[PDB]
Amino acid sequence: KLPPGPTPLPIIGNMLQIDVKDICKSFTNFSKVYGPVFTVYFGMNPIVVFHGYEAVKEALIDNGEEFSGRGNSPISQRITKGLGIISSNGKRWKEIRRFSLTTLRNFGMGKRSIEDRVQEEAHCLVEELRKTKASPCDPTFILGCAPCNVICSVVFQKRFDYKDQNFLTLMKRFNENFRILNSPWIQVCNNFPLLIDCFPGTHNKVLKNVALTRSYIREKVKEHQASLDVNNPRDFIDCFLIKMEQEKDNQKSEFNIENLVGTVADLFVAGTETTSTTLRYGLLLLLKHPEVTAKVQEEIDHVIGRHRSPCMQDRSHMPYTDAVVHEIQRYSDLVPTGVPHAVTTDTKFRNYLIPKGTTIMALLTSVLHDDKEFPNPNIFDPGHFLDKNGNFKKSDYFMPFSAGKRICAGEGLARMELFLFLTTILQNFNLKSVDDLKNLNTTAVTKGIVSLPPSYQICFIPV
Ligand code: HEM
Ligand SMILES: CC1=C(/C=C/C(C)=C\C=C\C(C)=C\C(=O)O)C(C)(C)CCC1
Ligand SMILES: CC1=C(/C=C/C(C)=C\C=C\C(C)=C\C(=O)O)C(C)(C)CCC1
Ligand SMILES: CCCCCCCCCCCCCCCC(=O)O
């Protein structure tokens, strides 16, 4: 028996009872009436939601093996075709995600570490902010390049010149497609496929952007295979090709070109817009909270100094800054409803039974905003991650990357980009607003699977 929930309508389920513009608002509201676990229907499809740390943990963690599946929706099926790591299941997923995790270790890609590739970008990042000559600007674009280049640097040999036209279009397609798919419309179309016909232009655009993007990713593999030296890998591509060669004999090996071009793409899409969005939400919060930013700058000066680039080792000596990066992710609440899962088999969740294949949703927001774990969860405060003596306080409720067997595969890289970008920037700059900080609103604009910070201007004044 499925978890109780609003009784649905004959064809559209509870659709005309949910705010497609702000789903969490609708879900939280259902929890006040149905409790921690409940069922809602998007059209014909049943979806069971988990609200609050207890339900979310029990699902993703305790009953982790059951809730580690990807549902495979209509839109989803014509893009990734089940290829890769974000949209794959079973044997193929376990093998691509184990390899990926292994090669995304700081030193899993040959001699140059991931950390070195990220520091180089942070430098180029501050270098671009210099070119704004301290005038007011919207950091969306420059701030969106760095995280893109990081991936480029991780899957290809060298990074791109910010002005390298080949980099720019390779960035717009991913952005363009990201904008398209982070619309409340993908929900409607995903549960009512027929509606997709009403959007030929949009549908054609996505397809084209995916063709060009994959097409370019396949070229970079051509080149890589003609210069491969199995002894010294250069990036994610080499590490994959080497693995391929080692599996060349068993013809049912998941390590084939298709999963490669697919996995690389998964890295871009899951790794660009996300950290890029968290960074942008971060500078805004530091721009609005000068008291927090000075304290951070005081740790940089003391531990890192002003001549050398910061590095991950500096975090263990900077509990305040770390707490600021942790509170930036909690507050920004990038992915409130979390990404949907599907159960691998008939599953008994405490008192109920969830049939295999059913779509599941663990509301990360409900954890990131638990008002017992983070007193006054609606206010930005590094203190939520600091104890009485100013030491870093970790929380089991810190799930901006989700939890369980499907936790973000590049969590290590997300945090490295956040730490090294924010501290490098705050070491060479101070944040000035063109107007009183009081005017500055921090309320996210939630209109899709991914929340964005409100638009804003910011002046990067060199210290
Ligand atoms: C601050 C930035 C980021 C945040 C908040 C974030 C968050 C998440 C979340 C919420 C998920 C879904 C977990 C689930 O299915 O339950 C996820 C998945 C994933 N992330 Fe990230 N992510 C970020 C950046 C990165 C980066 C930089 C990469 C790549 C190098 C990446 C790689 C992926 C991949 C491949 C998955 C799918 C994993 C799977 O289904 O097995 N992410 N991340
Ligand atoms: C990984 C990931 C993302 C992208 C998802 C992609 C490319 C496919 C999802 C397919 C699903 C969720 C299929 C299903 O189960 O029906 C977004 C950028 C939103 C946010 C951060 C984590
Ligand atoms: C499409 C899609 C979704 C949204 C993902 C987002 C926000 C961006 C995707 C970008 C891609 C798929 C880019 C590319 O590969 O070019 C969700 C998870 C709600 C459900 C399954 C279908
Ligand atoms: C200031 C400009 C006002 C004009 C507002 C026009 C609003 C209509 C928008 C229609 C969008 C439909 C897009 C369909 C795209 C497709 O073919 O898939």
Swiss-Prot record:
GO terms (BP aspect): epoxygenase P450 pathway; estrogen metabolic process; icosanoid biosynthetic process; lipid hydroxylation; long-chain fatty acid biosynthetic process; omega-hydroxylase P450 pathway; organic acid metabolic process; oxidative demethylation
Alphabetized Pfam families for the sequence: p450
Outcome after substituting residue 237 to M: In allele CYP2C8*4; reduces enzymatic activity with paclitaxel as substrate; decreases affinity for amodiaquine
Known cofactor(s): heme
Residue numbers of Phosphoserine PTMs: 73
Location of the protein in the cell: Endoplasmic reticulum membrane; Microsome membrane
Entry keyword set: Endoplasmic reticulum, Heme, Iron, Lipid metabolism, Membrane, Metal-binding, Microsome, Monooxygenase, Oxidoreductase, Phosphoprotein, Steroid metabolism
Residues where substrate binds: 73, 177, 214
A single GO molecular function term of this UniProt record: monooxygenase activity
Statement: the UniProt record of this protein carries the keyword Signal: no
Enzyme Commission numbers on file: 1.14.14.1
Reactions mediated catalytically: an organic molecule + reduced [NADPH--hemoprotein reductase] + O2 = an alcohol + oxidized [NADPH--hemoprotein reductase] + H2O + H(+); (5Z,8Z,11Z,14Z)-eicosatetraenoate + reduced [NADPH--hemoprotein reductase] + O2 = (11R,12S)-epoxy-(5Z,8Z,14Z)-eicosatrienoate + oxidized [NADPH--hemoprotein reductase] + H2O + H(+); (5Z,8Z,11Z,14Z)-eicosatetraenoate + reduced [NADPH--hemoprotein reductase] + O2 = (11S,12R)-epoxy-(5Z,8Z,14Z)-eicosatrienoate + oxidized [NADPH--hemoprotein reductase] + H2O + H(+); (5Z,8Z,11Z,14Z)-eicosatetraenoate + reduced [NADPH--hemoprotein reductase] + O2 = (14R,15S)-epoxy-(5Z,8Z,11Z)-eicosatrienoate + oxidized [NADPH--hemoprotein reductase] + H2O + H(+)
Pathway(s) where this gene product acts: Steroid metabolism; Lipid metabolism; arachidonate metabolism; Cofactor metabolism; retinol metabolism
Reported effect, residue 211 to P: In allele CYP2C8*14; reduces enzymatic activity with paclitaxel as substrate; decreases intrinsic clearance of paclitaxel
Family classification: Belongs to the cytochrome P450 family.
Role this protein plays: A cytochrome P450 monooxygenase involved in the metabolism of various endogenous substrates, including fatty acids, steroid hormones and vitamins. Mechanistically, uses molecular oxygen inserting one oxygen atom into a substrate, and reducing the second into a water molecule, with two electrons provided by NADPH via cytochrome P450 reductase (NADPH--hemoprotein reductase). Primarily catalyzes the epoxidation of double bonds of polyunsaturated fatty acids (PUFA) with a preference for the last double bond. Catalyzes the hydroxylation of carbon-hydrogen bonds.
Designated name of the protein: Cytochrome P450 2C8
Organism: Homo sapiens (Human)
